[PDB]
Design a protein around this ligand. Structure first.
Ligand SMILES: *[B-](O)(O)[C@@H](C)NS(C)(=O)=O
Ligand SMILES: [Mg+2]
Ligand SMILES: [Mg+2]
Length: 466
């Protein structure tokens, strides 16, 4: 034993997929502190979504398991007799889990506090973070999509997954030759529609494109949708998230019995306002439980929002420059050697990132003994588990294997980058492992990742369900 593990993993790393790829592979037995397996442990590689490990362990350190985010709506005075306020300010403070149901409940409170007429304009105050929406090196072709959604203090989160800065577009088909019905979701009335899509014949080619062209707030829909096709739904981003949350809170007040007389725009509570009257407040879930949808489904928006939030705790600045340092700081303070690291964002979306595998293993050992260990461990995706909120990105992976409901790891994935790091808690020692793969030519070496992980599940003393 022990040497067998070497041959097994050595052989797994011979696949034709590893033509001209660099692969960092580090396995350590937490209990003994034994270096089970190490190959290119110090080599510097792009982590992709394994950067979320760092951002998450750091959000814990800096923000606390119990940290919650609050939204506030302000006017310059309380409503009196006539139930009239002037300008109304929707003031967000870094809430990643902010639904339209919450804006309703805040619009409910605005009415019940006595406002009936917002005589001035309704304003969106997301000044809590900087107005820098996208990291330096993200791609303009990524912009339209949930993972490249803009970063704001005031964002509307969709679904129970809390996908920020996006509206769900719906394209139901109609009759052959007729244009299809496009439904812009929450951003109805905020975003432009450029519907050029047509309903095609029955069982015909599906070539439907839902896009938002760069630097525009226009949802340009193209292509064709069959008459028989299952109605389509897809997440697209808006320009200026808070301006949408503005528009949506607009609708809420109109609904809750409040006439709004002026325009909706971006704006920060003016400095001349002395003693503001806060008409509605809200409170998110505690971070620890926000970690779940964030880590399970690999939420980018959450990652960056948390960073910039980290930049507010330590520096008073909703800024990447501010939070990234703070992140690096916390991990250092966690017992982590930051020699190998290079941080250009929270999510791992930036190609400006670098990690080594020894560094990830380093992180994992440290975080494991942290007073926040178990909610961190929990937030991580679990192998082969049908439940999305438990499976995460490992739901359809390693099913019916020694790694099923066992391996707690996190995945990292983008063009020519693939990664798996985490815990294999076995009877023969809680294993922590990292596998980082860069610059492969053909398919994703997900098979080589699972293979390693399943074998490690077996070494730990597990066996495949039958
Ligand atoms: B992560 O889940 O690898 C994330 C960065 N992936 S991506 C490229 O935004 O889809
Ligand atoms: Mg609307
Ligand atoms: Mg088992």
């Amino acid at each position: 034993r022990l040497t067998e593990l070497r041959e097994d993993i050595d052989a797994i790393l011979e696949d034709p997929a590893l033509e001209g790829a660099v692969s960092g592979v580090v396995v350590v037995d937490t209990a003994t502190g034994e270096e089970l397996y190490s190959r290119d442990g110090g080599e510097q590689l792009l982590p992709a979504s394994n950067m979320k490990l760092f951002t998450a362990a750091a959000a814990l350190e800096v923000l606390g398991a119990d940290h919650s985010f609050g939204t506030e709506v302000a006017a310059e005075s309380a409503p009196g007799r006539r139930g009239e306020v002037q300008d109304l300010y929707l003031v967000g403070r870094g809430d990643p889990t902010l639904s339209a149901e919450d804006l309703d409940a805040m619009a409910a409170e605005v009415a019940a506090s006595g406002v009936r007429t917002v005589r001035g304009d309704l304003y969106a105050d997301d000044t809590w973070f900087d107005s820098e929406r996208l990291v330096d090196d993200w791609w303009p072709e990524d912009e339209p999509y949930a993972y490249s959604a803009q970063i704001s203090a005031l964002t509307v989160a969709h679904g129970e997954r809390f996908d920020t800065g996006v509206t769900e577009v719906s394209v139901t088909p109609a009759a052959e030759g007729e244009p299809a019905d496009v439904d812009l979701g929450a951003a109805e009335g905020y975003a432009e529609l450029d519907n050029r899509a047509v309903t095609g014949a029955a069982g015909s080619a599906n070539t439907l494109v839902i896009d938002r062209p760069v630097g525009t707030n226009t949802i340009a829909v193209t292509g064709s949708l069959p008459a028989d096709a299952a109605p389509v739904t897809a997440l697209r981003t808006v320009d200026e998230p808070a301006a949408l949350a503005g528009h949506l809170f607009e609708e809420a007040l109109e609904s809750n019995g409040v006439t709004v007389k002026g325009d909706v725009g971006l704006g920060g509570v003016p400095a001349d306002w002395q003693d503001a009257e806060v008409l509605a407040d809200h409170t998110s879930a505690e971070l620890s439980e926000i970690l779940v949808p964030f880590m399970k489904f690999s939420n980018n928006g959450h990652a960056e929002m948390l960073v910039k939030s980290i930049g507010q705790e330590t520096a008073g600045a909703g800024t990447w420059d501010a939070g990234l340092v703070g992140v690096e700081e916390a991990l250092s303070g966690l017992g982590v050697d930051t020699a190998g690291l290079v941080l250009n964002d929270g999510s791992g979306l930036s190609r400006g990132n670098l990690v080594t595998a020894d560094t990830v293993v380093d992180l994992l050992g440290q975080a494991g003994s942290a007073p926040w260990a178990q909610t961190w461990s929990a937030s991580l995706p679990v192998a082969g588990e049908s439940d999305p909120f438990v499976g995460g990105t490992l739901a359809n992976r390693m099913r019916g294997t020694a790694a099923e409901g066992v391996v707690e790891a996190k995945t990292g994935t983008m063009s020519g980058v693939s990664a798996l790091s985490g815990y294999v808690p076995g009877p023969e020692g809680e294993l922590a492992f990292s596998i980082v793969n860069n610059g492969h030519s053909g398919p994703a070496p997900l098979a080589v990742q699972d293979a390693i992980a399943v074998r490690l599940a077996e070494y730990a003393g597990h066996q495949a369900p039958e």
